[model samples]
Target: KDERRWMVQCGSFRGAEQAETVRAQLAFEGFDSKITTNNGWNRVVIGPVKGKENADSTLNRLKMAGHTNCIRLAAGG
Candidate 1:
């Protein structure tokens, strides 16, 4: 099985409000994600969902929503 844990980063922010706006948008688009901060950069992380889930589709959706630049938590897609 390809099931595993990971994340999708829509963007980065250093403030709580910015993080919330992005987090809300992700949720609205049917993505399960969260925002965590480290060293003042709030990382907009999505997932912990199955790796088997369509990664490319998720990336595409993010792009569709004007989040033109996004990446998985891992080094590669």
Candidate 2:
């Protein structure tokens, strides 16, 4: 079994409203997501899903849904 957690980062927006809008949209599309602020940008991220395959699938789905900038990352320990 995999021990590391993974995540999909959907977007980063300068406007908080825009970030929430994207987060809301992702939720509407059946993805559970959250926002984090770094410096001045709000980043939308989905899941520290338990496995790499799970994260990859989420990334592919987001990409197919036109969230082309989405990327998968290790969510850290």
Candidate 3:
């Protein structure tokens, strides 16, 4: 069986509105993005990156979209 290591999404927003805005921008640029709200904060995440290289590229793209604070995280089992 092949093992899959998930990549965690970093950064959080105070409201769903802020997170949704980021999500819409990312989607417009052709990258899949999602927003999750919990504990009074919203989180924007990019998922299932194929590898470290891809994750780097994803982060770069997010930065281009004005997400300079976005950070990469190791998958949590």
Candidate 4:
């Protein structure tokens, strides 16, 4: 099995509209964010960041955009 990379969960949007709102906000900031739905829940994930620095930069940008609830996760590879 491939080891997972570290991930950051931007937010858990309760509805499609809310998720879309967050997605749009991130996109506006040029993060290329995406909203994913799984098991009846919606979440916003930043990206496959190139490296740790890139991930941190993205996190900072998200925070500047008022996404303070985002969390960094260590992916299992």
Residue pairs with backbone atoms closer than 3 Å in model 3 (clashes): none
Q: Which window of ten consecutive residues has the lowest lDDT sum in model 2?
A: 61-70
Clashing pairs in 1: none
The segments of candidate 2 whose C-alpha lies over 4 angstroms from its true place after superposition are: 52-54, 60-69
Q: Write the per-residue lDDT of candidate 1 for residues 15-73, one digit (tens) a residue.
A: 45645665676667677567666635656677654465555556665543444345766
Candidate 4, poorest ten consecutive residues by summed lDDT: 64-73
Candidate 1 lowest-lDDT run of ten = 61-70
Whole-model lDDT values for every prediction: 0.59, 0.64, 0.60, 0.62
Model 2, span 1-59: residue lDDT tens = 56867776766666566566667766666667676776457776886666647676766
Candidate 1 stretches greater than 4 Å from native:
3-5, 14-18, 64-69, 74-77
User: Could you say which candidate leads in TM-score?
Assistant: 3
Which regions in candidate 3 have their CA more than 4 angstroms from the true location?
1-5, 14-18
TM-score per candidate: 0.57, 0.61, 0.63, 0.57
Candidate closer to the true structure by lDDT (higher is better), 1 or 4: 4
Q: Using lDDT as the measure, name the better of candidate 1 and candidate 3.
A: 3
Model 1, clash count? 0
Listed per model in order, the count of residue pairs whose N, CA or C atoms clash below 3 Å is 0, 0, 0, 3
Candidate 4 runs further than 4 Å off: 1-7, 15-18, 39-41, 73-76
